[PDB]
Write a protein that binds this ligand. Structure first.
Ligand SMILES: [Mg+2]
Lengths: 429, 434
RNA sequence: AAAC
């Protein structure tokens, strides 16, 4: 009547069938193809060919040459062609180059090719359609787009269904931030980084969370300390922003707390039984081979093997106070026999970019969380030493986020395709 | 509490809004159609035959090992609607400074002597040249003449023929040969005056600006840094303005900033280009950079900007990781989810899993771009939508979307090109850099 | 110097 029926090999020729079908509904044709519906059937298919279909096409490819479905479509279409005495009711669409002559279905060899290019084939098909009195509507690509979204993007949408960060909250802070002042200026060669406790040389003051007696036995004997000139600020209003003096401003308060937290973490990783690594910016902190139980912790691996190198899942940390949290960045640092670091950083980066593949959301999340739990003091907290009595408490469970949209979790074999193909591609890179 | 932004829809031909540029290109075709592609070839005779073989391959459809994440290549004429033959190929035989010198000499002599104009030029680089040395230098030297050029190697189109001592190919395209042809064809169509796609859900009269800074190592002054800007409306076809070479980089601070005597110049260039291309002044202007601007730059920007324009400055950073993890599954957080830190700071997940591809743009875990409205006043969700849209307009690669918005993606490459030649002054579209 |  008016429809344009396409028959094809469903699994192997769905690319060309998709392309041709969508292009044909784009041009206003009333196209009928087996892939243009969801939750479909032979009673309906045969009904369209017998009465509704005005033109019928087959995809003459090697894969679809001998297919029960397409052959039975060809049979019913031959019946309709005999009924309608149309010399070109059924039209081959040869898209396969390997399909040699005298190998096509006998009902087809005696009768448009896409082997050279689908554009040339589509033009030939369009002029063949125009030569016959093929009914059509004005070109409406809007309905073609609607069909593309409704059929081919139905499983590729986003659910309205209701995330573990690397941002670990700081539930409690030491109540006061203290600046120490001494009668004599500390020597310039005296490095505050060598101080056993976090301390920032701010102006002539020393910025700490700590007390005076913590470093009483490491400061030079030529320095005399006075307890009167130390100034304390209430930390709760430091976060609340209510603090305002000319000596120190809130924007500097939070930044000072940031480097205090960073140094506290760096010093804590000396008593946390963790080895160190030199990178461009900061200290990487990894777990040595031979220390962790079978290189696992709560049944998450943290250390492993890569060719003759050994990878160790290390971390670095950085505080922030906008909500007070700490971010942990995950690095992978290699050693050559589990003990000796690789001298040259180029192999380190190349090996890291090789190793990062095969690791995805759950693996990265579990490895970072395992390292954090390994760094915890309490079950649900991490204690950073800032003072002999003052401690910084950072919850070892990262921040939780209430989402509202997500995807239908697809087959993991698709992600395995991603893993293998992208792994090969990055090897090429 | 995350928020989600519906993925930006981009137009293609026939006024149809799709989401994947490859899907729209294969469905509706390019938004702006060109009658054809006239291609120019410069290289050795073996390079010529390799290029001819690769067009013979391009004419026929090429398939990917995964046709959902990387949709198949219908064939150039099937998707684009314009032919790229071997008869439209003009070849000039060739039998670090000297090599690019000969190549540029051939290109200029061809562009001058040949009567018939050529839409794009394609340069075949032998493997020895790649191993012993070019793209930035050559493509910069051709900036004066406004010659859109695409560079390919001998081992890129004929990778199967080139094999190592073990007999394996140097680099394997078997699984993504269709994707490689997709990208090459999209680049060639972009450089031929055709605009493959443009954003659809976008407000009228909005411009997006991106500043780029590149240091000069050969300069005696260690502080020197050239500047540049990139401008996009919604087309993704951006105009690039070269800045001034001089003391830009802040060495102790590690930042890049403009004195007010060049920020005015750059933004005035951007606004005059807008007025030429639109005949009106934009209602909003967004400036993008990897670093926050000092108040000097912002005031210099504000003086040259008209009163009715709500100038906004937004910085995009790959800062310290807020790497979200979905609780269940190895599938990362989907691309397009945003965290509203505050009305001026937000996180945008331009990478990660996308339902349309059932795949991930990011490799390991999507590191979000921290976007900050450091200057100006604008609604944060609108800025996130604009950056999400701008992530789609990378014409140099035929991919679903880009991790970095196009206003900042090619910062390093355009900087390398601009600083490759120091004695060259340039007015130009993005197609003369990518 | 297909490309991120
Ligand atoms: Mg390019």
């Amino acid at each position: 009547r008016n429809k344009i029926f396409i028959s094809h090999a469903t699994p192997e020729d769905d690319d060309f069938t998709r392309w041709l079908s969508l292009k044909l509904i784009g041009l206003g044709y009333e196209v009928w193809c087996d892939i243009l519906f969801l939750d479909k059937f032979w009673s309906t298919i045969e009904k369209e060919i017998r009465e509704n279909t005005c033109k019928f096409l087959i995809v003459s490819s090697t894969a679809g040459n001998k297919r029960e479905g397409v052959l039975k479509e060809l049979a019913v279409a031959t019946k309709v062609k005999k009924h309608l005495q149309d010399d070109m009711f059924i039209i081959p669409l040869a898209i396969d180059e390997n399909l040699s002559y005298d190998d096509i279905n006998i009902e087809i060899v005696r009768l448009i090719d896409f082997k050279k290019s689908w554009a040339k084939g589509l033009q030939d098909l369009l002029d063949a359609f125009e030569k016959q009195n093929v009914p059509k509507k004005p070109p409406d690509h809007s309905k073609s787009n609607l069909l593309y979204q409704q059929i081919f993007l139905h499983d590729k949408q986003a659910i309205e269904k209701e995330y573990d960060s690397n941002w670990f909250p700081i539930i409690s802070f030491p109540n006061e931030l203290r600046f120490h002042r001494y009668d004599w200026r500390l020597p310039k060669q005296f490095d505050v980084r060598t101080l056993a406790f976090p301390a920032i040389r701010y102006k002539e003051y020393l910025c700490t969370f700590a007390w005076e007696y913590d470093f009483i036995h490491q400061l030079p004997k030529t320095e005399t300390y006075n307890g009167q000139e130390s100034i304390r600020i209430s930390t709760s209003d430091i976060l609340s922003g209510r603090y305002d003096t000319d000596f120190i401003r809130n924007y500097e308060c939070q930044r000072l707390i940031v480097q205090l937290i960073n140094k506290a973490f760096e010093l804590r990783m000396k008593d946390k039984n963790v080895r160190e690594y030199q990178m461009s910016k900061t200290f990487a902190y990894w777990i040595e081979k031979g220390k962790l139980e079978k290189d696992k912790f709560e049944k998450i691996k943290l250390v492993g093997k890569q060719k003759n190198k050994y990878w160790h899942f290390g971390i670095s940390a950085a505080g922030k106070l906008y909500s007070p949290v700490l971010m942990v960045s995950s690095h992978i640092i290699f050693t050559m026999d589990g003990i000796n670091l690789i001298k040259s950083k180029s192999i380190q980066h190349s090996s890291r970019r090789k190793q990062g593949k095969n690791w995805w959301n759950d693996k990265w999340r579990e490895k970072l969380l395992a390292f954090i739990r390994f760094l915890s003091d309490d079950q649900n907290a991490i204690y950073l030493n800032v003072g002999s009595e003052e401690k910084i408490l950072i919850s070892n469970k990262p921040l939780k986020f209430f989402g509202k949209m997500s995807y239908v979790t697809p087959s993991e074999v698709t992600l395995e395709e991603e893993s293998v193909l992208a792994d090969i591609n990055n090897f090429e890179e | 509490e995350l928020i989600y932004i519906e993925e930006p829809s981009i137009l293609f031909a026939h006024g149809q809004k799709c989401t994947d540029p490859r899907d729209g290109l294969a469905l509706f075709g390019p938004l702006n159609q060109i009658y054809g592609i006239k291609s120019g070839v410069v290289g050795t005779q073996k390079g010529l035959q390799i290029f001819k073989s690769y067009l013979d391959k391009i004419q026929k459809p090429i398939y990917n090992h995964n046709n959902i994440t990387r949709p198949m290549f219908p064939g150039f004429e099937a998707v684009f609607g314009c032919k790229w033959e071997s008869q439209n190929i003009v070849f000039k035989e060739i039998t670090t400074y000297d090599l690019v010198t000969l190549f540029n000499d051939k290109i200029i002599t061809a562009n001058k002597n040949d009567e018939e104009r050529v839409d794009v030029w394609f340069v075949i680089v032998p493997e020895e040249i790649y191993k012993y040395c070019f793209h930035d230098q050559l493509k910069a030297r051709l900036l004066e003449h406004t010659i859109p050029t695409q560079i390919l190697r001998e081992s890129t189109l004929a990778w199967r023929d080139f094999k190592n001592t073990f007999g394996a190919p140097i680099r394997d395209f078997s699984k993504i040969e269709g994707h490689l042809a997709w990208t090459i064809s999209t680049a060639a169509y972009y450089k031929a005056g055709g605009k493959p796609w443009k954003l659809g859900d976008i407000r009228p009269g909005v411009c997006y600006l991106g500043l780029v800074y590149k240091k000069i190592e050969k300069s005696k002054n260690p502080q020197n840094a050239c500047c540049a800007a990139q401008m996009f409306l919604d087309n993704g076809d951006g105009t690039v303005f070269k800045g001034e070479v001089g003391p830009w980089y802040n060495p102790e601070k590690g930042e890049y900033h403009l004195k007010p005597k060049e920020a005015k110049a750059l933004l005035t260039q951007a606004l005059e280009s807008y007025k030429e291309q639109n005949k009106s002044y934009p209602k909003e202007v967004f400036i993008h950079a990897r670093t926050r601007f000092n108040d000097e730059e912002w005031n210099a920007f504000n003086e040259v900007t008209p009163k009715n324009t709500n100038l906004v400055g937004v910085t995009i950073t790959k800062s310290k990781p807020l790497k979200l993890y979905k609780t269940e599954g190895a599938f990362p957080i989907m691309r397009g989810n945003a965290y509203i830190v505050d009305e001026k700071k937000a996180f945008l997940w331009t990478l990660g899993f996308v339902p349309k591809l059932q795949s991930t743009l990011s490799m390991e875990v999507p590191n979000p771009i921290f976007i900050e409205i450091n200057k100006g006043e604008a609604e944060i969700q609108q800025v996130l939508k604009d950056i999400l849209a701008l992530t789609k307009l990378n014409y140099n690669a035929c991919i679903y979307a880009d991790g970095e918005p196009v206003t900042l993606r090619f910062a390093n490459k355009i900087g390398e090109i601009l600083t490759a030649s120091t004695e060259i002054k340039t007015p130009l579209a993005f197609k003369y850099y990518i």
